[PDB]
Design an enzyme around this catalytic site. Structure first.
Site, PDB file in Angstrom:
ATOM      1  N   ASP A   1       0.113   4.449  -0.478  1.00 19.76           N
ATOM      2  CA  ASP A   1      -0.104   5.975   0.225  1.00 19.76           C
ATOM      3  C   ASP A   1      -0.020   6.837  -1.081  1.00 19.76           C
ATOM      4  OD1 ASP A   1      -1.267   7.725   1.722  1.00 19.76           O
ATOM      5  OD2 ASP A   1       0.622   8.492   2.471  1.00 19.76           O
TER       6      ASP A   1
ATOM      7  N   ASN B   1       0.756  -1.253  -0.056  1.00 18.72           N
ATOM      8  CA  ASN B   1       0.113  -0.125  -0.207  1.00 18.72           C
ATOM      9  C   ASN B   1       1.018   1.187  -0.088  1.00 18.72           C
ATOM     10  OD1 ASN B   1      -1.238   2.371   1.085  1.00 18.72           O
ATOM     11  ND2 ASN B   1      -3.080   1.064   1.776  1.00 18.72           N
TER      12      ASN B   1
ATOM     13  N   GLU C   1      -3.868   1.595  -2.988  1.00 16.67           N
ATOM     14  CA  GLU C   1      -4.065   3.267  -2.780  1.00 16.67           C
ATOM     15  C   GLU C   1      -2.988   3.990  -3.849  1.00 16.67           C
ATOM     16  OE1 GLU C   1      -5.288   5.301   0.667  1.00 16.67           O
ATOM     17  OE2 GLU C   1      -4.808   3.471   1.987  1.00 16.67           O
TER      18      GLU C   1
ATOM     19  N   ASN D   1      -7.309  -4.357   5.399  1.00 14.98           N
ATOM     20  CA  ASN D   1      -7.847  -3.189   6.321  1.00 14.98           C
ATOM     21  C   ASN D   1      -8.367  -4.173   7.504  1.00 14.98           C
ATOM     22  OD1 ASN D   1      -7.556  -0.497   6.394  1.00 14.98           O
ATOM     23  ND2 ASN D   1      -8.501  -0.515   4.198  1.00 14.98           N
TER      24      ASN D   1
ATOM     25  N   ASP E   1      -1.689  -6.166   6.014  1.00 13.99           N
ATOM     26  CA  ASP E   1      -1.320  -6.679   4.529  1.00 13.99           C
ATOM     27  C   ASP E   1      -0.924  -8.007   4.541  1.00 13.99           C
ATOM     28  OD1 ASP E   1      -0.762  -3.894   3.021  1.00 13.99           O
ATOM     29  OD2 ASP E   1      -0.392  -3.611   4.950  1.00 13.99           O
TER      30      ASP E   1
ATOM     31  N   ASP F   1       3.110   4.646   4.808  1.00 10.28           N
ATOM     32  CA  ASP F   1       2.485   4.399   6.038  1.00 10.28           C
ATOM     33  C   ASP F   1       2.602   2.635   6.391  1.00 10.28           C
ATOM     34  OD1 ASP F   1       0.361   4.564   4.859  1.00 10.28           O
ATOM     35  OD2 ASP F   1      -0.658   5.466   6.396  1.00 10.28           O
ATOM     36  N   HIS F   2       2.682   1.972   4.944  1.00 13.82           N
ATOM     37  CA  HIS F   2       2.717   0.696   5.267  1.00 13.82           C
ATOM     38  C   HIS F   2       3.868   0.308   4.724  1.00 13.82           C
ATOM     39  CE1 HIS F   2      -1.786  -0.501   5.196  1.00 13.82           C
ATOM     40  NE2 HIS F   2      -1.606   0.948   4.891  1.00 13.82           N
TER      41      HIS F   2
ATOM     42  N   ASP G   1      -3.984  -4.852   1.157  1.00 12.96           N
ATOM     43  CA  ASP G   1      -4.290  -4.358   2.265  1.00 12.96           C
ATOM     44  C   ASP G   1      -5.816  -4.888   2.711  1.00 12.96           C
ATOM     45  OD1 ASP G   1      -5.108  -2.638   4.307  1.00 12.96           O
ATOM     46  OD2 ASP G   1      -4.562  -0.761   3.326  1.00 12.96           O
TER      47      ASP G   1
ATOM     48  N   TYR H   1      -7.732  -3.696  -2.294  1.00 10.17           N
ATOM     49  CA  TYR H   1      -7.538  -2.620  -1.401  1.00 10.17           C
ATOM     50  C   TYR H   1      -9.123  -2.512  -0.739  1.00 10.17           C
ATOM     51  CZ  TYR H   1      -7.663   2.112   0.840  1.00 10.17           C
ATOM     52  OH  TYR H   1      -7.886   3.206   1.711  1.00 10.17           O
TER      53      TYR H   1
END
Length: 281
Positions: free
Chosen positions: A33, A31, A59, A175, A246, A271-272, A173, A134
């Site tokens: 971002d 991911n 993302e 989530n 993930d 951030d991942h 991801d 995602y």
């Protein structure tokens, strides 16, 4: 506030299966971002170093029509497919880049309601089908939890379908941190997006229904503090206060082919962090 650093050192890459067969396929999932933000943060540098056969990105926040030219600097991943929200804006989005062209590439999960946000690519290969996803975030205040539950059911049924025809690898991801061991602070997050009982339950249903195995947890059943996401806020990454969101989930029939499932903790760009699968197919 109540957490300090918790150590985690991802074990060495195991590049041969339990039966001695060398890995033949390396898939990396990340991911990012935002494709553009990630690129500025030297994301492509890791990719070139990792040299996967397949790269799955989440993302991207970018459409097939508006990609950064910098993506062309991945010669070893020349077959590139992108899904983006149908409204044409810069959020969500997934990408799949591959050394070889898949037999077929599809987008979405065959359901109009859930196919408008650029969340899923399906890439069919000779001996297996790869899905990258995602998954919809439950949202601040859990305002999207009701929809997430609808997504979870639809996605499970869809994947059950694919797996009935070919061995399935699902990555991306998702989530959700499945169990308490999958995040640093389970107690204070049970009412937060990513660790609600609903979401955890949905993940459990996915594993049983398809069925699928959690590649990382399968290999490292008792290993704590292994995460793939840390909030940008509050020095969370430096303290390893994170979540494992993930995954690579595998059809049971692919377990004998499983060499390793890695978490590239130190790779920056988002951030991942990236995750990497080695399969002996």
């Amino acid at each position: 506030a109540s957490e300090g650093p918790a150590l985690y050192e991802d074990p060495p890459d195991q590049k041969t299966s339990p039966s001695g067969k060398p890995a033949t396929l390396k898939i990396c999932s990340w991911n990012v971002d935002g494709l553009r933000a990630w690129i500025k943060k030297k994301g492509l540098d890791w990719v070139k170093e990792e040299a996967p056969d397949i790269l799955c990105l989440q993302e991207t926040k970018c459409s097939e029509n508006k990609l950064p030219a910098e993506l062309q600097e991945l010669p070893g991943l020349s077959h590139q497919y992108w899904s983006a929200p149908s409204d044409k804006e810069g959020y969500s989005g997934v990408g799949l880049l591959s050394r070889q062209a898949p037999l077929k590439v599809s987008y979405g999960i065959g359901d109009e309601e859930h196919d408008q946000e650029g969340r899923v690519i399906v890439a069919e290969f000779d001996s297996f089908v790869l899905v990258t996803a995602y998954v919809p975030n439950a949202g601040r205040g859990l305002v999207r939890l009701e929809y997430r539950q609808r997504w979870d059911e639809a996605f499970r049924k869809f994947l059950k379908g694919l797996a009935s025809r070919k061995p399935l690898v699902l990555c991306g991801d998702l989530n959700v941190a499945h169990e308490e061991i999958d995040l640093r602070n389970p107690k204070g997050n049970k009412k937060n997006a990513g660790f609600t009982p609903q979401e955890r339950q949905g993940f459990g249903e996915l594993l049983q229904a398809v069925p699928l195995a959690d590649s990382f947890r399968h290999l490292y059943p008792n290993t704590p503090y292994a995460y793939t996401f840390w909030t940008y806020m509050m020095n969370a990454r430096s303290k390893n206060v994170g979540w494992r969101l993930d995954y690579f989930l595998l059809s049971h029939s692919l377990l004998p082919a499983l060499c390793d499932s890695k978490i590239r903790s130190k790779a920056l760009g988002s951030d991942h962090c990236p995750i990497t699968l080695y399969l002996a197919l």
